[PDB]
Amino acid sequence: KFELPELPYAYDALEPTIDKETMNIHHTKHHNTYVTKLNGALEGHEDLKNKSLNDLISNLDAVPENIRTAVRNNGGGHANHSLFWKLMSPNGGGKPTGEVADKINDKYGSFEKFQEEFAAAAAGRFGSGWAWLVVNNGEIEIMSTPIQDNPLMEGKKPILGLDVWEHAYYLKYQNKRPDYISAFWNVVNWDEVAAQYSQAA
């Protein structure tokens, strides 16, 4: 029921920023694994096996203790990475657009301002985890979920996130995470962020 999604672009379609090589691994390895561990946990747990990844991820209570964690770590990863793949593009980057843009300025004053905040957050997260641009009600803040936890698990709808696990950049940038973070901006598809905004609200 849960399947590994197709990359809307080539694996080298981002080769300057993120090396096609990690793209290959991070996609056909890690991610896939999550989709695997996931499907094979809900195996036999009927009522669960009938829920959307989102619902499933949201109400982490309906899942029995015995496998709650696995649906978490694997349910989140599969969800997080799923989103990630779409928040980049060979024909993307630049500055935000749409209401998302405005809101961003209403927020931290200027986009560059926001960025400086985000970059800081993405670098804040110790160990593994992700950084995001939630949308709590008519508002949007900046947070960072550890390991694979997804913000939807706290009632906050994501619209932008950045894998910060060292496996998402250690090949090309090793320990220089800020560099990886700076680079990110070039590929980020604000069109998606936009769409992901209207739906949430």
Residues 6 or more apart from 154 whose CB is under 8 A from it? none
Angle between helix 190-200 and 99-108 (nearest 10): 90
Residues 151-170 that bind Mn ion (CB under 5 A): 163, 165, 168
Out of Mn ion, its own copies, Zn ion, none, which partner does residue 163 contact, by CB within 5 to 8 A per kind?
A: Mn ion
Out of Mn ion, its own copies, Zn ion, none, which partner does residue 200 contact, by CB within 5 to 8 A per kind?
A: none
- DSSP, res 148: T
Residues 5-64 that bind Mn ion (CB under 5 A): none
Nearer to Mn ion, 71 or 168 (CB): 168
Q: Is 127 near its own copies (CB under 8 A)?
A: yes
Is 163 annotated in some ligand binding site? yes
Q: Which two tokens stand for residue 87?
A: 């928040």
> Residue with structure tokens 């935000």?
96
Bridge pairing between strands 129-132 and 161-163: antiparallel
Binding positions for Mn(2+) are 26, 81, 163, 167
Instruction: Kindly list the residues in this chain that would bind Mn ion in the complex (CB under 5 A).
Output: 163, 165, 168
